[PDB]
Every structure is written in C-alpha cells, then in structure tokens.
Nucleic acid binder design. Structure first.
Length: 90
RNA sequence: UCAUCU
C-alpha cells in the first residue's frame, strides 16, 4: 500500500556518511525520512547513495516505523537525482 | 528516525 505516489519535495538535508536524510513534502510541508536505500535513481556519476541538500525530488510515501517515509526516490519524472556534495564525483 | 559527513 502506497499512501501517496509521485509526491514532489525539497530535500531538507541528507547525511551521506550516516545514510539518511529528510525531505520536505511540497504538498503538505511535512518532513519525511529518506533512507539511503530508498533512492531509486542515484546520480550515475557519483558512487554513493545520496540526495543533496535542497534538491527537488519525486517519491512515494509509505508507512514506516517512526512515521511516514519516502521510497522510490528519483528526480522529477523518474530521472536521476543530483546527489550530495558530500558524495564525491567519480 | 533531525543527521552535521567534501
């Protein structure tokens, strides 16, 4: 079950070293947790799993253990995310 | 799951 699909949001922050971040939903203005494994289309020219602070992402919302979370996270229209400056380019 | 990392 998916609570919401293709939600658009702005990354609040994402910690590359520790592997998680938060996205602010553009529709409800609620922060949602995003795990590194929830990123579906990583920047193919970085080599870590990440989204970058402030970038615009598109995602599904599902029920987590500590609140609703983001999953299937991509750029708008399913394109690769930009990724974090804390994740070096190849 | 509110982290603090080039």
């Amino acid at each position: 079950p998916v609570l919401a699909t293709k939600v658009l949001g702005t990354v609040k922050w994402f910690n590359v070293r520790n592997g998680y971040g938060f996205i602010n939903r553009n529709d409800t203005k609620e922060d949602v947790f995003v795990h590194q494994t929830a990123i579906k289309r990583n920047n193919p020219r970085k080599f870590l799993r990440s989204v970058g602070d402030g970038e615009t992402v598109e995602f599904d919302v599902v029920e987590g253990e500590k609140g609703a979370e983001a999953t299937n996270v991509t750029g708008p229209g399913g394109v690769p995310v930009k990724g974090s400056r804390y994740a070096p380019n190849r």
